[PDB]
Amino acid sequence: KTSPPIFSKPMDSNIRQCLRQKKKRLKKRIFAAVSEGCVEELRELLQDLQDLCRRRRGLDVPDFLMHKLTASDTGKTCLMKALLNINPNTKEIVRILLAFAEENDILDRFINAEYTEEAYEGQTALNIAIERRQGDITAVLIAAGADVNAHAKGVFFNPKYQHEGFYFGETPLALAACTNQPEIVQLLMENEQTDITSQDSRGNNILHALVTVAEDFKTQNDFVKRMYDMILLRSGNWELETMRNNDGLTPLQLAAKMGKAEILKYILSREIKEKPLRSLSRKFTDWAYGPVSSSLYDLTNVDTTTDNSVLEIIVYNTNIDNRHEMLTLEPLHTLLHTKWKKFAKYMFFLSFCFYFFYNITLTLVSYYRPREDEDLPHPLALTHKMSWLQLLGRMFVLIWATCISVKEGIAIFLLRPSDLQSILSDAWFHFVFFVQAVLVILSVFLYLFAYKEYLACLVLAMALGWANMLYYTRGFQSMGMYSVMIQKVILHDVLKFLFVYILFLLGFGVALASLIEKCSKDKKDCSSYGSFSDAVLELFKLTIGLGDLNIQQNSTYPILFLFLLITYVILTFVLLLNMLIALMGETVENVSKESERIWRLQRARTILEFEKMLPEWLRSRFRMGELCKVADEDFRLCLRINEVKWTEWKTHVSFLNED
């Protein structure tokens, strides 16, 4: 993606880089013989190794012999070098190397060997055989004492990113499962020493590991769905799918964290009909008659009742790709729609009314202020009591403004740094609601010091206040697009047109202000291009189309003053301004193509954020789901959902081929 990785030492190297002595020719000539496939040259070199071991001090002969078979810079052995280079005669050089280590008491050490390298640590001879797809060499090595629980930890086998390495699950069972080799997976699970409930350095197990390697888009061949079904259904218990890693996530919650929509649909809709495996399912269909059916969903680690539920991960954590496609799955779709009809319509309506009456009060009191030198109060709370009836509206300003500044200021403090790179993560409205409430109470405090700059701050509070009414247009679908593409346009288009337009507004502004002469004879001010600040204003009025091409200029070089104004009008009114209108037209077109996807993801935040304001006795009232016994000795919560599907049923009936 970004950059290719660097590795400090290569795993295998048959390319010699640039810059009869038995202590050199024994060790080096075996590696080259076993790599090319010279069988006859190999037996003639092994019998020379035991010749040096007879002229050696006793009781240390296995330690001396392994040093002449293992490398020193890395822990790669003769059997590892043999299996990385597959030849047509590697079935027999395994037999010859296994026979040499059986003649000594070194067979247990020669197979269970590990790399000592910092970058390839823990890799054994089973990892090379399962990688190179040698199915019959694997059965021999298990039958000779290979550890089937060896973990391969390292910088290569556990990277930081999805590139820069190759993560598969760190066990030999997970390597066979992530390489689409179903027969070796059947082979290891039928062995007694295989620990299925095993965990790696990330805390993952085999079901966590298959989620990380799955495709985030639906395609034709999906072997990670058939491997998740195959390994789960053989264990026949609950310990795998209820286990948490170091981040505290199940296999179900890691699919919603990473964004895999096809693995998520499979787990929420499992239904197994055989009697010993009935209890593993999460959906229970009890009656169906034509198109209609009734079903029960599992709802255990899904609904908003514990921490890190799958309804809360999908909504709040943007940068996940498929968030609309997952919120329309079936246990999730009914839960959001039920929370809207039961308490969320009415809390969203009271927020619109307590804010619309806040702005009518703050406007009528600011507009109708006493405009005299002899009458100067601040228009708030009756700080000087003139005793007029219903003064509570002036009290209602300072009460409701200090509530918003406390509440929204906490929400700015709780912002993730990924919440500032999405429009849908509504971090714009947390800023602007805060600064409108600060300026209200700042203007009240500056009258108590009587500075008479309160009116500069009270005017800006009315203009932001009526501009924040654009938040509440997400209640309707039709008006919910205009608050979105007023923000796509002002970031993708206007802040890139701004840097180009200052270069032409600075350059011609200094140039036109340097060609004039001082016209103040007796305070005439004939020249409208006198200063730098006067010339930038008259050039802005000409891109808009409000100024004049006044040629009668009291200055030297009158024909050069015409050449530089007409060049400005062509570049910035005919060419640049009509260009930026054709860049707004491409942004507006793409928001309207996706108007439904954007409106539905803005409700789902407002539904789950009014739920965190409710008290606990009130949230316990609206809990949807009842206790239910779906099999023997197992109790769980459930939703009953009826579903009538006319288009799916009629295609099932027409295609049936009654002939």
**C-alpha 201: how far from chain center:** 22
- Residue 623 makes contact with its own copies by CB under 8 A: no
Q: Which residue type does 203 have?
A: G
- Residue 84 makes contact with its own copies by CB under 8 A: yes
Per partner kind, with CB cut-offs from 5 to 8 A, the member of its own copies, ligand POV, none near residue 642 is its own copies
- Residue 108 makes contact with its own copies by CB under 8 A: no
We find the least distance from the C-beta atom of residue 245 to its own copies, in angstroms, to be: 22
Rank residues 36 and 102 by Cβ distance to its own copies and give the closer one: 36
- Residue 413 makes contact with ligand POV by CB under 6 A: no
Whether the CB-CB separation of 393 and 361 falls below 8 Å is answered with yes
- Residue 37 makes contact with ligand POV by CB under 6 A: no
Rank residues 116 and 308 by Cβ distance to its own copies and give the closer one: 116
Which residue intervals of 86-143 are DSSP H helices?
A: 90-103, 107-111, 125-131, 135-142
Phi-psi region of 259 (alpha: psi -120 to 50; beta: other; left: phi over 0): left
- Residue 86 makes contact with its own copies by CB under 8 A: no
In the region spanning residues 339 to 358, those forming contacts with ligand POV, defined by CB under 6 A, are 343, 345-352
x-or-dash pattern for ligand POV, window 548-587, by CB under 6 A? ---------xxxx--x---x--------------------
Q: How far apart are CA 309 and CA 311, in angstroms?
A: 5
Rank residues 19 and 495 by Cβ distance to ligand POV and give the closer one: 495
Q: How far apart are CA 136 and CA 184, in angstroms?
A: 10
In the region spanning residues 164 to 193, those forming contacts with its own copies, defined by CB under 8 A, are 164-166, 168, 179-183
Q: How far apart are CA 344 and CA 634, in angstroms?
A: 33
In the region spanning residues 348 to 407, those forming contacts with its own copies, defined by CB under 8 A, are 363, 366-367, 369, 371
We find the least distance from the C-beta atom of residue 493 to ligand POV, in angstroms, to be: 9
x-or-dash pattern for ligand POV, window 428-447, by CB under 6 A? xxxx-x-x------------
Phi-psi region of 545 (alpha: psi -120 to 50; beta: other; left: phi over 0): left
Whether the CB-CB separation of 461 and 362 falls below 8 Å is answered with yes
Q: How far apart are CA 312 and CA 256, in angstroms?
A: 10
Per partner kind, with CB cut-offs from 5 to 8 A, the member of ligand POV, its own copies, none near residue 407 is ligand POV
Q: How far apart are CA 645 and CA 653, in angstroms?
A: 13
Q: How far apart are CA 79 and CA 85, in angstroms?
A: 10
Structure tokens given for 566 = 């007409």
- Residue 16 makes contact with its own copies by CB under 8 A: yes
Whether the CB-CB separation of 528 and 534 falls below 8 Å is answered with yes
In the region spanning residues 540 to 579, those forming contacts with its own copies, defined by CB under 8 A, are 540-541, 544-549, 551, 556-557, 560, 564, 566, 569-570, 573-576, 578-579
514, 529, 548 from 510: Cα distances, Å = 6, 10, 19
User: Binding its own copies by CB under 8 A: which of 38, 96, 329, 641?
Assistant: 641
Q: How far apart are CA 567 and CA 552, in angstroms?
A: 18
In the region spanning residues 161 to 220, those forming contacts with ligand POV, defined by CB under 6 A, are none
We find the least distance from the C-beta atom of residue 549 to its own copies, in angstroms, to be: 6
Cα Rg, the chain, nearest whole Å: 38
x-or-dash pattern for its own copies, window 116-155, by CB under 8 A? ---------------x------------------------
User: Binding ligand POV by CB under 6 A: which of 106, 155, 457, 584?
Assistant: 457
The contacts of residue 339 (CB under 8 Å, 6+ apart) are: 607, 611, 622
Of 196-204, 257-265, 413-421, 585-593, which segment contacts its own copies by CB under 8 A?
A: 585-593
Q: How many CB atoms lie within 10 A of CB 22?
A: 11
Whether the CB-CB separation of 603 and 340 falls below 8 Å is answered with yes
Per partner kind, with CB cut-offs from 5 to 8 A, the member of ligand POV, its own copies, none near residue 551 is its own copies
Backbone angles phi, psi at 547, to 5 degrees: -90, -170
Of 98-106, 442-450, 503-511, 603-611, which segment contacts its own copies by CB under 8 A?
A: 503-511
In the region spanning residues 433 to 472, those forming contacts with its own copies, defined by CB under 8 A, are 455-456, 459-460, 462-463, 465-467, 469-470
In the region spanning residues 465 to 524, those forming contacts with ligand POV, defined by CB under 6 A, are 467, 469, 471-473, 475-476, 478-479, 487, 490-492, 499, 502-503, 505-506, 510
Per partner kind, with CB cut-offs from 5 to 8 A, the member of ligand POV, its own copies, none near residue 422 is ligand POV
Which parts are annotated binding residues? Answer: 545
224, 301, 458, 586 from 214: Cα distances, Å = 6, 22, 56, 34
The contacts of residue 616 (CB under 8 Å, 6+ apart) are: none
User: Binding its own copies by CB under 8 A: which of 24, 276, 478, 633?
Assistant: 478
Rank residues 392 and 653 by Cβ distance to its own copies and give the closer one: 653
Q: How far apart are CA 378 and CA 314, in angstroms?
A: 48
Which of 112, 103, 21, 95 lies closest to 62, judged by CA? 103
Half-sphere exposure of 233 (CA within 13 A, CB side): 18
Rank residues 403 and 631 by Cβ distance to ligand POV and give the closer one: 403
Q: 34: burial class by Cβ within 10 Å (0-12, 13-18, 19+)?
A: buried
Rank residues 106 and 511 by Cβ distance to its own copies and give the closer one: 511
**Kind and range of the H or E run holding 498:** helix 494-513
Which parts are annotated binding residues for Na(+)? Answer: 545
Backbone angles phi, psi at 627, to 5 degrees: -75, 140
Interface residues with ligand POV (CB under 6 A) are 343, 345-352, 360, 363-364, 367, 403, 407-408, 420-423, 426-431, 433, 435, 456-457, 460, 463-464, 467, 469, 471-473, 475-476, 478-479, 487, 490-492, 499, 502-503, 505-506, 510, 531-533, 536, 557-560, 563, 567, 610, 613-614
